[PDB]
Amino acid sequence: TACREKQYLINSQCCSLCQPGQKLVSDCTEFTETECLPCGESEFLDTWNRETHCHQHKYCDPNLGLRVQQKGTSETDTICTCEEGWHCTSEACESCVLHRSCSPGFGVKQIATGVSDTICEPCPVGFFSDVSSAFEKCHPWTSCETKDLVVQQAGTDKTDVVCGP
Amino acid sequence: EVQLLESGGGLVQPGGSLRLSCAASGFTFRDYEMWWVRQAPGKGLERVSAINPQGTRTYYADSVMGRFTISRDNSKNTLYLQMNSLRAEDTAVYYCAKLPFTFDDWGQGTLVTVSSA
Ligand SMILES: [K+]
Numbered sequence: 001t002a003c004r005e006k007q008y009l010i011n012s013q014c015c016s017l018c019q020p021g022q023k024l025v026s027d028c029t030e031f032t033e034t035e036c037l038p039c040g041e042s043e044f045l046d047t048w049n050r051e052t053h054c055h056q057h058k059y060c061d062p063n064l065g066l067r068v069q070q071k072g073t074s075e076t077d078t079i080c081t082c083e084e085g086w087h088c089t090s091e092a093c094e095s096c097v098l099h100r101s102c103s104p105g106f107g108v109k110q111i112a113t114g115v116s117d118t119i120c121e122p123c124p125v126g127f128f129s130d131v132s133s134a135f136e137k138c139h140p141w142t143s144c145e146t147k148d149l150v151v152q153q154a155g156t157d158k159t160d161v162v163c164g165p
Numbered sequence: 166e167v168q169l170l171e172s173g174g175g176l177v178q179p180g181g182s183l184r185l186s187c188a189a190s191g192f193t194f195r196d197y198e199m200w201w202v203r204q205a206p207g208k209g210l211e212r213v214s215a216i217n218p219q220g221t222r223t224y225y226a227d228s229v230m231g232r233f234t235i236s237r238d239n240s241k242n243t244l245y246l247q248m249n250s251l252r253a254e255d256t257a258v259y260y261c262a263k264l265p266f267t268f269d270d271w272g273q274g275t276l277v278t279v280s281s282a
Pocket of ligand 1: 102103104105106107129130131132133136
């Protein structure tokens with residue numbers, strides 16, 4: 001049994017898989033090899049397979065801000081990207097955002113289009129950021145040492161120091 | 166449901182000034198961070214300015230600092246951009262964007278043309 005790699009396919013015998021860009025049309029026999037037929041126009045198959053039909057290419061919806069980076073072939077799917085300077089939300093680039101924001105407890109290090117998405121940092125001790133923002137940096141804690149004020153409430157990465165007398 | 170309707174954009178002479186507005190509807194405008202972005206024809210997308218919900222904190226691009234002013238009327242649910250000392254580089258289509266800045270979270274645009282026509 002066992003069956004070799006990049007050949008795989010077992011069913012009383014060991015058959016060769018179809019090369020990427022080819023669908024499976026007929027199984028192999030004792031004396032005949034596996035029969036594979038190429039994928040049709042607008043269709044693909046990206047791996048050594050035993051698939052009887054090819055998959056359709058994904059479309060880069062202009063209304064989603066998508067633009068085709070690489071036209072799909074019979075072995076690879078269409079690769080999409082954003083308009084620029086729009087940024088992909090996933091590695092798959094299935095949606096675009098102008099830029100990402102930095103949630104409370106995080107501050108910005110800017111967004112300059114073309115790979116340059118917002119760089120966030122986690123607010124060091126003595127700094128805070130309430131609000132979700134794509135421009136706001138971490139702000140420093142009040143003082144409570146200026147007018148020789150108290151301290152009253154600690155001060156978080158999300159909240160500021162609150163002071164009395 | 167988000168509608169952002171830019172206006173104010175027209176043909177102005179260099180050195181001149183314009184006031185752009187973005188009328189928001191379909192969301193609680195007073196609670197969202199807003200941005201102004203411009204796109205020159207052919208040339209790249211550029212982030213001009215940004216404002217926090219209360220209108221107390223702002224950001225400006227180095228290329229527009231000192232000449233441009235972002236502001237908001239949370240009663241009327243409108244965002245503004247006062248453009249002064251206008252130059253030909255400022256010729257672009259101006260858009261306004263709503264956080265979380267999806268391709269659905271921005272307007273139709275308002276054309277600003279700076280020339281001697
Ligand atoms: K923040």
